[PDB]
Amino acid sequence: MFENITTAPADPILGLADLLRADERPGKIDLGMGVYNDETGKTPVLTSVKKAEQYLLENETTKNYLGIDGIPEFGRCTQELLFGKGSALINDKRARTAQTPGGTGALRVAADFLAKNTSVKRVWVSNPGWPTHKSVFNSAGLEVREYAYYDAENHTLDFDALINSLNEAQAGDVVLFHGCCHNPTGIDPTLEQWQTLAQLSVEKGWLPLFDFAYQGFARGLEEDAEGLRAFAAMHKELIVASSYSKNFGLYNERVGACTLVAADSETVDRAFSQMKAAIRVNYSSPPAHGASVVATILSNDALRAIWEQELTDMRQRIQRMRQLFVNTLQEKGANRDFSFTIKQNGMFFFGGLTKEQVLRLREEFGVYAVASGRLNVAGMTPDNLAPLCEAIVAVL
Amino acid sequence: MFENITTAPADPILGLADLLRADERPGKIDLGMGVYNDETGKTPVLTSVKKAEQYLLENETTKNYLGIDGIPEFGRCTQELLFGKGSALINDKRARTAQTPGGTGALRVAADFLAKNTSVKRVWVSNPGWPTHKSVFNSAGLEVREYAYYDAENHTLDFDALINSLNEAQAGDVVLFHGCCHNPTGIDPTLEQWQTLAQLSVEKGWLPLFDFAYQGFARGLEEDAEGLRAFAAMHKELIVASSYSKNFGLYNERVGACTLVAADSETVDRAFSQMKAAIRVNYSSPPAHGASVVATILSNDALRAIWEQELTDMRQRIQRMRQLFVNTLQEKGANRDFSFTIKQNGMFFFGGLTKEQVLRLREEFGVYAVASGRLNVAGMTPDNLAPLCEAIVAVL
Ligand SMILES: *Cc1c(COP(=O)(O)O)cnc(C)c1O
Ligand SMILES: *Cc1c(COP(=O)(O)O)cnc(C)c1O
C-alpha cells in the first residue's frame, strides 16, 4: 500500500530544525524559526508561566475533557485582549472563541470551517508572506491568490500596489491580514491605512481573516490591536486566528484561538456550532495545560503585571539587537546600508539577502536562515553578533 | 457570509455534556462519556501524573517547539508498549510514531494521510461501533462501510457474521479493529480469533488500522496487546492510533499517537514523511505537557511501578462495580437477567436498553446515558448505585 509513496518536500521554515540537527559543527548560529532567545541564546520559560504552572500543579483536581471549544475563561480573556475590555462585540455577544492547538491549528479550523460551510473559494495572502498560509488553505481545498505588499527598494509598504492587487478580489473572497509584525517584512499599515483598508473591505464585500501571532511585539498589546479593531468596528463578520506561542513563550504547548464574529448573537451561535463540528472530527477537544496557564495569568492581576513586563523586556531586547546588528555591520565593513532594518517590527530582519547568500551563509559559515532572506533578530546575542556580521559581510 | 449556515447536529456522545450542563436537577447521574470515576464520583489526577508534573515543573528549561512528530522518547515508549520491548518491528526499524492530540487526533492524521497518499477509498468499521469513526473518516473524504460484530441475543461476538460481512471488503480496503475493550460491546476476539483474522487479513489484502484507547483495561497491558501483536507478526504494513486519555487519566491534555508500520525502514521513512506533511498543515507540532508526563512515567522505574498499580486499581474498581450492578439489579426487582454484563471488558455496560428507555431515564430520573444503550460502569459508585438501579427497574 505504501510502496509508491513519494517523499514529501521539506518545510522551508520548520525544515531548518532538521538541518541544524545534522550539522555537527561547534558554533552554528540558528536564526531560522521565529522563537525568542534571551541574551544567553536560550529560549526560557517565562517566570509568570512558571508561577502559573506552579498554581495549576497545586489546584488542579482533574484532567477530564474540556468542552469542544476549550476553557471558557480562556475565550473571555482572548476576546478582551483582541477587541478591548469593553468592546461592543463582546457586549452584543457577537463573537465566539474556540481554544485551538496553536495559531496554526486555528487557521486549519478556520479553513475547514469555511470550505465546508460557506461559498468561499479563494483566500488572498500577501507576497512576500508566510508559506504555511498557502499550505494550510490549499489542504482544505481552497485556492490561494497573492496580493502585492512590499516595496523592495524603498523598504516600505507599497500601499498603492496593495490596493491595485486587491481590486481583483471579488465579494465573498477571504483576505488574510497579519495583525501586526508582518511576517516576514516587519512592515505594518499605519492606523490611517488600516482604516482605509477597513472601508475598502466593507465596500468590496471581503471576509477579513486576521492572523495575529505577535500581539505585543510591535508597540504594545493595545496599540498592536488597533488595526484589527478598526476592522471590527465596520465589519459585520470576521475571523481571527491568534496565537500565544510567542507572547507567552508557550510554543510547544500549542495555545491558540480561532475567534468568529457575526452580525448578531443568533447568527454567530449557529455558525460557531459548525466550527465546533469541524473541531470534533479533527482533534475533538484542545490541550488544557497551555491555555490554562494563559487564563491563569491573564485573570490574575499580579501574574499579569509580571507577564506584561516580561513581554516588554522581550520586545526591548529585540529592538536593542536591531541597533547593534546595524552598527556592527557598518563597523565590520558592510558595503551596503542596512539601517532600514530599524523600521521593521517584530523578530525578523528582511530584504537584504538573496537565496544564494543564505545558502553560502549556511554551508560556509554555519549560519542558518530562511531561503527568503529572513533572519531571526531575536536569535542574535551580544556573543554571536560578531561572527554573525563577519559572515554576512563576507557574502555581500 | 454566515447568514445561511445550518446548526450542526449534536454529537451523540459529547453532546451529553451540554445536556448535563443545562439540567439543573440536584442528583443527576452521569453515565455518558467514557471517563473513569473513583468511588467518590470524581475523575482524579493520578498520583504518578502529579509526581511527573512536579518533576517537569522543576526541570523544564524551555517550551521551544517540538519536532513535527513530537517527543522522541514518547514514540519509543509507545512502540515498546504496543509491540513488546524487544519486538522485531522495533529492531528492524519498521515503525515510526507521531505524537498526536489524543487518539482522535491520531485517527484524523491517519485519515488525511491515507486519503491524500494512497488508493484507499473505503474504511470498514464494526456495527455496533463508535460514532466518531464514521465522522472522522467521512470528513477526510473516505466512505465508511460497516461489518457485523455482535450477537444481540447471546451477547457474544458473532464471529461468523463478522467473517461473512468482511468478505465484501476488497484488497486495498482499510479495516478498523478496536484493540481491546470494544466500544461499546466490550466483547473482544479471543487470541485464536485474532489469529484467524490476522491470516484472513493478509490473504484478502486489507490494511489493518487499530484504534487502541483502552490498553490495560481488559486484562493487562501486555495481554491487551496480543491481538495487535498477532497482526504485526504477519503484516508488512499497518496503522495504530493509540490514546493515553484513559489509561493515564490525561483526557484534556490530548495525548495520543499514530504509529505507521511498513515493510522496511526505507519505505516507512518515506511514507512517514507524508504523514508529517499532513500534520504540518493541521496543528504543526503536538502539545508537550501531556506527552511529556507519559514519557517521564514510562521511562522511570519508580513512577512506572506506581502508575501500573493505579491502572490496575482502576480496572479492578470497574470490575467490582459490574458485579454490584448486576446484584443490586436482581435484589431490586429486575425482571430481566443482566449477568451477561460480567463478560464485558472495559468501562461500559451494553445490550439491555432501548433508546426510549434511555430517554425516559434522562427525562424522568436524571440518569444520562448514550442513546445506543451504553452506560459507563466506571461512573457507578456505591453511593449512586441504589437510585441508579431503581430507575432502571422502573423503565424495564
Ligand atoms: C508564529 C505564527 C503563527 C502561529 O504559530 P503557532 O505556533 O501555530 O501558534 C501563525 N502565523 C504567523 C505569521 C506566525 O508567525
Ligand atoms: C477514548 C477513545 C478514543 C480516543 O480518545 P481521545 O480522547 O481522542 O484520546 C478513540 N476510540 C475509542 C473507541 C475511544 O473509546
Swiss-Prot record, chains A, B:
GO terms of biological process kind: L-phenylalanine biosynthetic process; L-phenylalanine biosynthetic process from chorismate via phenylpyruvate
Induction and repression of expression: Transcription is increased specifically in response to 2,4,6-trinitrotoluene (TNT) and its indicator compounds 1,3-DNB, 2,4-DNT, and 2,6-DNT.
N6-(pyridoxal phosphate)lysine: residues carrying this PTM: K246
CDD domains in UniProt: AAT_like
List of residues binding L-aspartate: G34, W130, N183, R374
Biotechnology: Has been used to construct a 2,4,6-trinitrotoluene (TNT) biosensor strain.
Molecular functions (GO terms): identical protein binding; L-aspartate:2-oxoglutarate aminotransferase activity; L-tyrosine-2-oxoglutarate transaminase activity; protein homodimerization activity; pyridoxal phosphate binding
Catalysed conversion reaction: L-aspartate + 2-oxoglutarate = oxaloacetate + L-glutamate
Oligomer and partners: Homodimer.
Protein name: Aspartate aminotransferase
Organism: Escherichia coli (strain K12)
